Amino acid sequence: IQMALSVCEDLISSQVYAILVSHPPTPNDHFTPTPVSYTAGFYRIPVLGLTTRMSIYSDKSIHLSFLRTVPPYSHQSSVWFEMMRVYSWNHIILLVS
Amino acid sequence: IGIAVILVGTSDEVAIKDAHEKDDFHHLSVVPRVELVAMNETDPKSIITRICDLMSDRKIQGVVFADDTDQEAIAQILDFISAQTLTPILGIHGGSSMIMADKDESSMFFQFGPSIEQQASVMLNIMEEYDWYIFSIVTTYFPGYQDFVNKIRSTIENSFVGWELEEVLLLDMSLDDGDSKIQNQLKKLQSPIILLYCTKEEATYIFEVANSVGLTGYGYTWIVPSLVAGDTDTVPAEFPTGLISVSYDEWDYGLPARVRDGIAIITTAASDMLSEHSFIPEPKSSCYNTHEKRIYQSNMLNRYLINVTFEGRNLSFSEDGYQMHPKLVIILLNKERKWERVGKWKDKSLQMKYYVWPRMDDHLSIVTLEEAPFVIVESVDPLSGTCMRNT
Amino acid sequence: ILGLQLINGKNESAHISDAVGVVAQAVHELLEKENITDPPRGCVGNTNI
Amino acid sequence: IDLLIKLARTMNFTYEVHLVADGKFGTQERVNNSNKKEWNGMMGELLSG
Numbered sequence: 001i002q003m004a005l006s007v008c009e010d011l012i013s014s015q016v017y018a019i020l021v022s023h024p025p026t027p028n029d030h031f032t033p034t035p036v037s038y039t040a041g042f043y044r045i046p047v048l049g050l051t052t053r054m055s056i057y058s059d060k061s062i063h064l065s066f067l068r069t070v071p072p073y074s075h076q077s078s079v080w081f082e083m084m085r086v087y088s089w090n091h092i093i094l095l096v097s
Numbered sequence: 098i099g100i101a102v103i104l105v106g107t108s109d110e111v112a113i114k115d116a117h118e119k120d121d122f123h124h125l126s127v128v129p130r131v132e133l134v135a136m137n138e139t140d141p142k143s144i145i146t147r148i149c150d151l152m153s154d155r156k157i158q159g160v161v162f163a164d165d166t167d168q169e170a171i172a173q174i175l176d177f178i179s180a181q182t183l184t185p186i187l188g189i190h191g192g193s194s195m196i197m198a199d200k201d202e203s204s205m206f207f208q209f210g211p212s213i214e215q216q217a218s219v220m221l222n223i224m225e226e227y228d229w230y231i232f233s234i235v236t237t238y239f240p241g242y243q244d245f246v247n248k249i250r251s252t253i254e255n256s257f258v259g260w261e262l263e264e265v266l267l268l269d270m271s272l273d274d275g276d277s278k279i280q281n282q283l284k285k286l287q288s289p290i291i292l293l294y295c296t297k298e299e300a301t302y303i304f305e306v307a308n309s310v311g312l313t314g315y316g317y318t319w320i321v322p323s324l325v326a327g328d329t330d331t332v333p334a335e336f337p338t339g340l341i342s343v344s345y346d347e348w349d350y351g352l353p354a355r356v357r358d359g360i361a362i363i364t365t366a367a368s369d370m371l372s373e374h375s376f377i378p379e380p381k382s383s384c385y386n387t388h389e390k391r392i393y394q395s396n397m398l399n400r401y402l403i404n405v406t407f408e409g410r411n412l413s414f415s416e417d418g419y420q421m422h423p424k425l426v427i428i429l430l431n432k433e434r435k436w437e438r439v440g441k442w443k444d445k446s447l448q449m450k451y452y453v454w455p456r457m458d459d460h461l462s463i464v465t466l467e468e469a470p471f472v473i474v475e476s477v478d479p480l481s482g483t484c485m486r487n488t
Numbered sequence: 489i490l491g492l493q494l495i496n497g498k499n500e501s502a503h504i505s506d507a508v509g510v511v512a513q514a515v516h517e518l519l520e521k522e523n524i525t526d527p528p529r530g531c532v533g534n535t536n537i
Numbered sequence: 538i539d540l541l542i543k544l545a546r547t548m549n550f551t552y553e554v555h556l557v558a559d560g561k562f563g564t565q566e567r568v569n570n571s572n573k574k575e576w577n578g579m580m581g582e583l584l585s586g
């Protein structure tokens with residue numbers, strides 16, 4: 001609720017340059033980075049993501065002003081290829097949502 | 098179901114006010130609460146505040162948003178209200194016109210305007226009509242290129258028409274000192290038709306390199322999507338004459354017209370639920386208490402909100418949330434640095450005024466007569482719209 | 489299960505030091521050129537990027 | 538089929554013979570409602586698994 005307002009009267013009213021996201025208390029949720037990258041996203045105010053594990057904040061077509069200090073879940077595919085590159089695996093079947 | 102027509106900027110609210118009040122069909126409870134708040138909703142605080150007091154004051158269950166400025170991501174913040182709440186919101190014009198790539202699974206958003214996939218298919222239809230089968234693609238790291246190329250690639254792959262695709266370039270100005278990194282590859286282009294996908298700001302820059310190499314003037318025809326055009330009035334004076342682009346119709350589909358059909362879509366869809374529900378969904382008249390206000394979910398409305406036909410023309414939205422059959426217009430840059438309308442695209446049909454291309458001396462007409470093995474004419478192929486092979 | 493995890497990625501308390509390190513060292517070059525603008529003032533008063 | 542018998546014995550693999558449905562050797566042809574050329578006959582029965 002307040003996240004929509006949590007940037008106007010208390011964050012960008014105090015001459016902010018960059019905004020640091022929080023970490024949701026429940027790990028299996030992503031409400032935390034959605035509003036900061038929306039209100040400040042179209043304000044051209046960069047937002048740094050320190051606990052944003054989802055891969056949605058990786059296009060910048062939406063969430064234009066967003067930086068992340070942790071690679072998302074989708075980057076696990078980058079190491080997987082190198083992981084089977086050392087075990088010579090070639091016949092794999094992906095099981096994704 | 099109250100509908101709040103929200104329009105901001107420098108426009109005519111009375112035209113919206115008069116048109117909205119003239120409900121064509123009274124068989125459904127339109128009850129349009131047209132607040133028409135003219136206050137500039139550019140700031141998030143203005144728009145987010147007014148939405149939940151509009152729902153508080155009038156107990157509305159529907160909003161239609163209109164805008165005049167660019168507002169490249171005012172739909173991004175608008176989608177957040179749709180996701181957090183459950184009241185459908187339909188874009189009309191302005192900052193909600195551009196199609197968002199991906200939204201929330203529960204996003205109650207439906208925009209007016211073709212998607213990138215639709216913009217990729219219409220350009221090919223132009224190419225099919227004029228038989229420019231040989232083409233090349235230049236793109237950037239901008240999102241949607243993985244979809245723009247894929248739509249082109251899928252259509253080209255396994256086709257009766259002998260398409261010729263080569264030299265796919267995936268470099269732009271994002272890389273530092275890229276001036277020497279784009280000239281070497283730009284010299285590899287040889288097709289007369291080049292398909293471009295970039296940003297309007299870099300579109301002028303990317304042509305400056307092309308002009309330096311010499312891929313400009315006559316003999317080369319380039320096609321660009323809607324977002325590259327940006328604004329018809331804003332001509333950067335850098336785009337070459339002959340830049341043919343496709344964009345949503347900003348002239349014919351006027352703002353009073355948009356609300357007329359737009360306000361109809363939500364009313365007929367919501368009233369369809371009341372036939373099978375007999376209970377109008379009532380989200381809490383506030384922008385708080387979302388934990389307890391989301392129990393009475395009305396996602397069944399969304400499942401059939403897309404499939405809606407009004408006055409014969411089907412205004413159905415795609416599942417991703419883009420118009421299925423939009424009224425696209427083809428725009429071309431003449432020699433006077435002004436965008437010129439060419440033709441209209443709808444119902445998978447490409448009809449345009451110029452039956453032949455106005456390119457002109459490398460373009461010489463030839464008059465021939467249908468006689469003998471010297472010249473033979475039999476028919477045209479209507480299955481795909483192309484004439485034939487080896488003819 | 490040949491699973492996979494990450495190290496030093498959940499140290500959110502220690503993450504901000506690196507998080508502030510890059511931006512603080514980035515404003516040094518930010519305020520080192522011409523026409524360096526000012527961040528938007530307030531919410532309602534400001535109206536554009 | 539005789540050549541198949543000698544091919545299977547010297548390769549250690551079991552075979553089940555099933556004929557085509559349409560009965561054509563294989564070619565690429567247009568389909569109604571847009572071009573979308575597809576293989577028919579053996580070739581369609583080999584690329585489709």
Ligand SMILES: *[C@@H]1O[C@H](CO)[C@@H](O)[C@H](O)[C@H]1NC(C)=O
Nearest residue numbers: 544545546547548549550551
């Ligand atoms: C063929 O396979 C069978 C069992 O699978 C066994 O006789 C042997 O592995 C093979 N015989 C050959 C290659 O002669």
